[PDB]
Amino acid sequence: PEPRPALIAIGSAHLDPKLKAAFQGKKQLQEAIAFMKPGVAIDAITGTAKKDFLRFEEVVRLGAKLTAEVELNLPDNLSETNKKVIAG
RNA sequence: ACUGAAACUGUAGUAGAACCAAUCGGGGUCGUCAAUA
């Protein structure tokens, strides 16, 4: 059988357009949405921070509400029961 | 003379080891005070 495409198109999730409009021009705030999280491996013997395993990861602040546009290109003959299966 | 499809930048990793908020100190004890006329 030929490979089936998806019925569902899912966009990227972006911040609310008014919130992104507020960030325009504010490079300092644009960086401030994220902060450094440290990570370090500990030596299982000596119990000490294993140097050059010290690590900083950028993480984005919790509370973000992001939204993606979804398109369901369902088959036009699809049974109403099968619609409920997909929705389910 | 006709949009490829489909695919999680994820997986493992303790911001930690070491460092005394501490050193010294009797809750004690005796000579005046004042400057003019």
Side-chain angles (χ1 to χ4, degrees), chain A residues 2-3 13 16 19-20 30-31 34 38 43 45 47 51 53 56:
Chain A
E2 289 173 39
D16 166 80
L19 173 64
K20 325 220 316 191
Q30 290 164 22
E31 295 307 320
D43 175 28
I45 303 298
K51 63 152 48 185
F53 296 64
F56 300 97

Side-chain angles (χ1 to χ4, degrees), chain A residues 7-24:
Chain A
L7 301 189
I8 192 173
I10 313 180
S12 304
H14 297 283
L15 296 169
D16 166 80
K18 303 295 294 189
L19 173 64
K20 325 220 316 191
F23 275 100
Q24 265 174 60

